[PDB]
Amino acid sequence: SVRIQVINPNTSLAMTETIGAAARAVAAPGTEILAVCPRAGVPSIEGHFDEAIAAVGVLEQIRAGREQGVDGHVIASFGDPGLLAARELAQGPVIGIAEAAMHMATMVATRFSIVTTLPRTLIIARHLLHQYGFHQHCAALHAIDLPVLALEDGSGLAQEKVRERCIRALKEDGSGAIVLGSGGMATLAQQLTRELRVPVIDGVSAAVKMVESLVALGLATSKHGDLAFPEKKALSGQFQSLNPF
Amino acid sequence: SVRIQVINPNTSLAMTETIGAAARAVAAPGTEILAVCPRAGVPSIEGHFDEAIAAVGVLEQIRAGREQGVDGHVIASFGDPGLLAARELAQGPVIGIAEAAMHMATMVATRFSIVTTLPRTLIIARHLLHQYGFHQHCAALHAIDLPVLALEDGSGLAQEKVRERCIRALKEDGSGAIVLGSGGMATLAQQLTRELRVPVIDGVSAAVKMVESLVALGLATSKHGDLAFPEKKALSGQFQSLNPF
Amino acid sequence: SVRIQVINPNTSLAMTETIGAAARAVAAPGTEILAVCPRAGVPSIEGHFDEAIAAVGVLEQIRAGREQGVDGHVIASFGDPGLLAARELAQGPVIGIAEAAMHMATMVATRFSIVTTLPRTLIIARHLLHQYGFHQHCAALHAIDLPVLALEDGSGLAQEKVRERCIRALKEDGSGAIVLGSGGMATLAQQLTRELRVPVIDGVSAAVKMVESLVALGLATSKHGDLAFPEKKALSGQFQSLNPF
Amino acid sequence: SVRIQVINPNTSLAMTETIGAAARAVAAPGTEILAVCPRAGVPSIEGHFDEAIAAVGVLEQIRAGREQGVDGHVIASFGDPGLLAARELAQGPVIGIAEAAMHMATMVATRFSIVTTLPRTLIIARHLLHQYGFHQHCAALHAIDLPVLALEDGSGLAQEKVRERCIRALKEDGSGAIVLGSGGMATLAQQLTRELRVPVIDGVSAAVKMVESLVALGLATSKHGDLAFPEKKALSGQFQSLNPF
Amino acid sequence: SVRIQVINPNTSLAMTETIGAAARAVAAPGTEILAVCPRAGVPSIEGHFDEAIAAVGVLEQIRAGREQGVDGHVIASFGDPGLLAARELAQGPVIGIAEAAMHMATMVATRFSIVTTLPRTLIIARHLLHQYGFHQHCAALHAIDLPVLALEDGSGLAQEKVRERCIRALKEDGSGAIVLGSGGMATLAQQLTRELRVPVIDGVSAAVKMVESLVALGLATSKHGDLAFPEKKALSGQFQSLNPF
Amino acid sequence: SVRIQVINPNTSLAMTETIGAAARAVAAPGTEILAVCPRAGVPSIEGHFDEAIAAVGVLEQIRAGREQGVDGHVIASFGDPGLLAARELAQGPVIGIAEAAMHMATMVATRFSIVTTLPRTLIIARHLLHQYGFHQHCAALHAIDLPVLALEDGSGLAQEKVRERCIRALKEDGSGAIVLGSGGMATLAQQLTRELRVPVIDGVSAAVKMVESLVALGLATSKHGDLAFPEKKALSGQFQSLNPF
Numbered sequence A, B, C, D, E, F: 001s002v003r004i005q006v007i008n009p010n011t012s013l014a015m016t017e018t019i020g021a022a023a024r025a026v027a028a029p030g031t032e033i034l035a036v037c038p039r040a041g042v043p044s045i046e047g048h049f050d051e052a053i054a055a056v057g058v059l060e061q062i063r064a065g066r067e068q069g070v071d072g073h074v075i076a077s078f079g080d081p082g083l084l085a086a087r088e089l090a091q092g093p094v095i096g097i098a099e100a101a102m103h104m105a106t107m108v109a110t111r112f113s114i115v116t117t118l119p120r121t122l123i124i125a126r127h128l129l130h131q132y133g134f135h136q137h138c139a140a141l142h143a144i145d146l147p148v149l150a151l152e153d154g155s156g157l158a159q160e161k162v163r164e165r166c167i168r169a170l171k172e173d174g175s176g177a178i179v180l181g182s183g184g185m186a187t188l189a190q191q192l193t194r195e196l197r198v199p200v201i202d203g204v205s206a207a208v209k210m211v212e213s214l215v216a217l218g219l220a221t222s223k224h225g226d227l228a229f230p231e232k233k234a235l236s237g238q239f240q241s242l243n244p245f
Ligand SMILES: O=C(O)C[C@H]1NC(=O)NC1=O
Pocket: A010, A043, A044, A045, A046, A076, A077, A078, A079, A116, A117, A118, A121, A148, A181, A182, A183, A184
């Protein structure tokens, strides 16, 4: 009845599997999850250069989703790359996982702490806090100091580091909830919530619920003004397939 | 399967009916709506004095809801009176309608305009924008300059004034969506959305979807720190029934 | 000549005595202090639930004060519960102790540190800093980690903890003054100011001086717009005695 | 018993008379007002260049006041020139009239409007709003578009323009109080308050009450850190008389 | 001696010519301007979708510039697309034209007004104001309500509309300078500055001077932390040529 | 061809020499540096009192510079004393060294750390961060805890303390660049940049490049509104020589 395209903005199939599993686990009856990733791009997003590439990969999948007539989209990287670009191209609502996780956090706690993977991505999360208006609601931001793909390397080291950092955050930061800062951390939320007795929030699952909510409310992206469909123009070279509508 | 207590913070049964109808219209399969209002309080909330009274009325119903073992609560007045107080008392999540409407607005538009009823309540909405962190996302705030209960007087004047103000807001404000600033405007959202071809958002319906989402995510109010259950103490006089837990 | 109603929002007579003593100690010649507390409510305010109850208790006393024809009111809890509600109901000015202490602090120092009692009340103080616009003027917020009523238990432990925390704040925070974050700390200000050679500010005494100042200036709460007397309506049950005017 | 030096930062004796009259009118029993102005400087302050000159003139009088052993000081220009410099040099508290008027405004209204004299001084008032943290509390800023000294030219034109602008501000701005943006407007506050039935606030009178309040509280400028007495050094030329202490 | 790559992020050669002419007109002796545009992309940037495409086009040229060993780069669209991504990839400094124009404006005026082309791009300029921290320095933002490429259509209509809007801005906004909000407006700055007797600032010319300044200071992008070279990884498909270093 | 007056706001000839050397080292071909200091004032600026004195000393030199017909001015103290006053008096652009250093820092790094000399001057730097709008771009502010003139005492202790503090800042703060917080640190920038492999920015050299840039762009201070020449009036006593124009 409801079809939601969950887009992993990086090209890692391993991370797409983790994201897809988290999305399906919370999906309402009648909801089909279409877990996808770009055909071309970057295996993991670890900075501004990676984000710019990922943004176009998102748009390629948004185009595919709109052609399929999906009800909504999820951008499944914690930088929410190409969010507003995607909202212009898509008819159905587009929700970022950082956006969704932060939104949910303010509903269950006064302040939250972010636990992400790489230190150099903290600035990206800081920018999003300011952009979304949740800076005052964020007590602290932390990184476990590992490459993004360490969450998929099977060692369990990244997962243990997340757990330890969450425990330390709840003791030190003066926050009531944890926002997981990675699509690769998606399947950790439930176990950490049960273990630590506080909301540990995965943006993937949260974004799925936001799309479902908006669809049930009969609400989609405003095509009045800022997020209207892109102005009609000829796209050249590698970009010519992005807007056939 | 899921029971959500939707609390009208004012004592108007007429407004409770409007709020209850909007909540049931969007409720997911398996969701039961318990539309309630305080036994004692104020017929409509039109200022800070009214809000303080309404806040205690909310708590009385929160207590009743928790005794019944409901899955979540909705505070159905645009000032979200007693929101954090309710989150302390309740186990299940508590979502305000102003909170929910503003949250939804940022997901479908870059900026939104608020249309409320009385001018003196604009300051309350301004304070909430700052508190929730959506001040930059709000292009303008407007009032139709009628008493709150004019929405329930059967004349249709308030409803027409809302429509006209929404049209003018979309032309002048530089916004892409409308946030309805009253529980009494709840049943107007769908018709105005279809008519104006932009998201016109009712917080009542939005808050219901937020509660459903949080319950499906296995998330509830953090009892770690700020929103923990109230400290054990003896309440005197009229307040003695508020915390029997 | 000038009568000021100093309202302890909690029901502790012990704290009312401390607050009353601090108010009378600085009162100008011709000023009578009416130290009161609600007939029904909470013994101490330690969270949002407690604040909501205290707010209505304040209003009950505001009503009594206005009937007596007092020149002004003081809300003597560091959360300033029901401040704007009280300003609507009262004719004479209403000053919160957090408000007054913060206002005074900016007049004698570039930045101040707050020392309150319970950790879970720090968020309430943070919210007030943002609401009043003094966030940039506050270097740090601290709690001594004891129940509010520990200040009245006769052990002197809370008083010693305040002193030690003030010393540590002045060494570490980069602030020039201390704002005491409790009505129960009211009588500590003078001794700590003399001992530490910096302004240690009690909001109770400060608020009394603000009321006296406004009365001498011939200024009272604006009844134009936002803080006008509450709209005429029937209050039901426990609330029916709040607005007989 | 209490001696307060009220410093007009400009060299206009006419404005010093207006400022002195406003200060004495509200002074508590036992308070002596010492109305002064710099021996050298600028007849009126109408920009940043004028402010820089006025700041040094303030310091010259602060030095004189401290030599006389006055209990406190008032800086009686709406730009509060040399406020922090004065607080370093003086032992007793130093209160600016813009500072005091804005502080009082937030105690009697949710939002205020500023009415000053020259348009080019609006930016100075804007900067002070941000510095003091009252930007959100200011609904609008207006200028009557006349030279500062027009208030002293005997025509009554400036006074009528202030009145008309206050009436228009209360109708349009969505504010509950007026802050007078000139030391030359000081004696207009009472009449406008009575006429318009809202708080029309003069910073001169307000600052006097703030000094009296701080003295009665046993509070003075913190000499710990930022506002400590200036570091011991040799001042050359025209400045050699500024710090003989 | 100094080679600066000035990148037009859109594919319009006409706009590249305008941008190149403005860059060469102010270039210091010894400075060579390399005016370029992407081989693939969008003819004009008129929204978030266009920006995402332009960002990758910028990166393609950044790669080419770094291979050539240029001293610095300029991103010549008013949305500064891919600015931080470019700073990661490039060794020499990368300056956006919106960034440079806003920076220059604060050095010659207290507040500035922005005049851009399309209304839907105003939100992009608003976001940059917040990101760069110049929101308080911007009095107003305006659009002439024409397509971006109207500046290159030879009619002179867009140019006249810019002039008229600048005149109206200086009369109404309370600003002292104009920031031109288009790379297509680059060659209008000098004539408008001379005509209106105020700074009318072109970001293209300003950014060139910023690059020259940084090179002369011996300063380049920090490779410590956030703007370090992208993490070593395999780029697939259309993106494989972006990082051969 | 281009003459830039670089004003040391303090009276230390030793610091004037350091400032002058840094300015000449980066000056473009054809640029003459006029390194000056006030005839009367303070040997070093270490607080608000010192700043007020320095501001008038700056104006005395601005007057001299304008009489000589210089192309621009630099205010060479990290508090940028009398910046807006100087912009009113001068025809050519006036750039502060704190202003210039902060501006440059945002062009080469996401966030910067400030290293100044005396702790009591940190508040002045904090105020400038807010005024210029770079608060979010500043990760931390540090002082080496020595008198300002320790940089000129020949011991090399201050220079070593700056180096050590820069190393610690880059390890702890999460910043990519260092802003030197003293005119006395001007000649340290190049060596520290080469040693630490990050941008270590001197405001003196940066401000010189900003003046050169503005002159080449044909841009000067706006005389429309806020920064117009001071209103024509008689200056008395020591101030009578400040505005002979
Ligand atoms: O994973 C991270 O830490 C951040 C972001 N990067 C990415 O490839 N997926 C993400 O969610």
